[PDB]
Amino acid sequence: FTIDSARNIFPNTLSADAVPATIARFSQLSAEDQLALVWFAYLEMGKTITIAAPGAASMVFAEKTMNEVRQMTPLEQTQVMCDLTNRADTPISRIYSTWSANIKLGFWYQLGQWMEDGSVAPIPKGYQLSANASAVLEAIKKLEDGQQITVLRNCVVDMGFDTSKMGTYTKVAEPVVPPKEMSERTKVSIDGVTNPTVLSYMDNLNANDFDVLINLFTPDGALQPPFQRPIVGKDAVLRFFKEECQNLKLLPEKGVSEPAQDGFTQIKITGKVQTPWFGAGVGMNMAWRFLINPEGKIFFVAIDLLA
Numbered sequence: 001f002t003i004d005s006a007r008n009i010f011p012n013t014l015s016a017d018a019v020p021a022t023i024a025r026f027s028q029l030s031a032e033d034q035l036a037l038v039w040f041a042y043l044e045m046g047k048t049i050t051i052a053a054p055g056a057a058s059m060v061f062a063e064k065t066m067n068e069v070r071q072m073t074p075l076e077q078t079q080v081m082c083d084l085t086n087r088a089d090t091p092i093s094r095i096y097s098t099w100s101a102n103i104k105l106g107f108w109y110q111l112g113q114w115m116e117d118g119s120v121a122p123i124p125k126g127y128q129l130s131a132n133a134s135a136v137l138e139a140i141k142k143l144e145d146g147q148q149i150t151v152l153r154n155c156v157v158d159m160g161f162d163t164s165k166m167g168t169y170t171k172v173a174e175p176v177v178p179p180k181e182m183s184e185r186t187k188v189s190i191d192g193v194t195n196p197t198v199l200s201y202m203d204n205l206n207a208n209d210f211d212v213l214i215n216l217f218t219p220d221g222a223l224q225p226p227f228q229r230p231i232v233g234k235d236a237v238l239r240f241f242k243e244e245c246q247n248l249k250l251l252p253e254k255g256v257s258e259p260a261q262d263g264f265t266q267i268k269i270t271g272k273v274q275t276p277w278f279g280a281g282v283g284m285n286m287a288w289r290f291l292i293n294p295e296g297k298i299f300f301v302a303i304d305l306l307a
């Protein structure tokens with residue numbers, strides 16, 4: 001096996017490629033239409049589900065820029081949001097690109113709160129979307145909740161100046177929370193799968209115990225998040241666990257295990273995952289595809305958002 005051939009296990013797994021499809025339609029619109037479309041989608045979503053605000057401890061790297069935006073005049077505030085949306089080269093747009101996904105989301109959550117109470121320049125009353133933007137908004141409102149919040153997250157994440165041409169820069173993330181209190185941990189069960197490596201992957205992720213979790217991988221192993229390329233090697237995979245994978249709740253329900261070539265094992269689990277942004281408000285339907293070597297170490301795992 002190679003990582004590239006490991007990618008193809010269980011090829012009838014149908015992922016939700018409506019998500020990148022919708023994002024690409026979104027990318028065709030004007031900056032102002034993009035901001036207004038998301039505002040209208042956000043407001044509609046808030047009728048039924050509520051974002052859990054992040055702790056102030058996780059926003060320490062964004063706090064000063066956020067207060068700067070609030071104190072700006074309305075026209076400056078609108079220009080900052082447009083700059084981010086167009087991925088313009090401005091100081092705020094560069095700083096934004098050094099932030100982890102959760103810091104970026106908290107930044108836009110705070111702006112959205114301030115747009116509601118009138119502190120930040122709101123979407124003009126009687127704003128009219130272009131016909132193409134109107135079609136995108138309706139499409140987004142039609143997606144199931146798990147796919148809706150993934151479109152919204154991926155829009156937020158892709159804003160800011162292109163990371164490729166700020167060169168050497170420190171990527172910044174939320175504090176690394178200590179592993180969960182032992183008495184506070186739960187024990188997953190999976191109908192049809194008792195493989196100890198897969199159970200330990202689930203339990204350690206649910207406990208935020210990334211030092212233990214990373215030891216489940218081969219040194220050259222890889223993890224592939226939904227709609228992304230594989231992250232290769234223990235060092236990069238551990239950075240991703242710390243930067244992006246804290247406070248998830250994984251609820252695998254059932255799975256199947258099959259031999260693969262050379263005493264490898266290929267395992268597919270389906271279930272739900274909750275993000276801390278929404279808790280039980282949004283249960284995302286996920287698949288996990290593991291390729292495990294004869295010693296029981298993860299050579300490859302893909303995580304798919306299901307159609």
Ligand SMILES: CC1=C(/C=C/C(C)=C/C=C/C(C)=C/C=C/C=C(C)/C=C/C=C(C)/C=C/C2=C(C)C(=O)CCC2(C)C)C(C)(C)CCC1=O
Pocket residue numbers: 034035036038039042051105108109110111112115149150152153156205224225226244245248250273275277284286288303
């Ligand atoms: C932007 C904007 C707005 C503001 C908007 C906002 C504030 C939008 C906020 C949108 C939010 C808060 C979106 C969050 C989604 C969290 C997601 C998809 C998680 C996936 C985690 C997963 C699948 C589990 C993943 C995984 C498991 C299972 C593993 O096994 C391994 C790990 C891994 C992570 C791969 C305004 C409203 C101001 C209007 C203007 C405007 O543009």
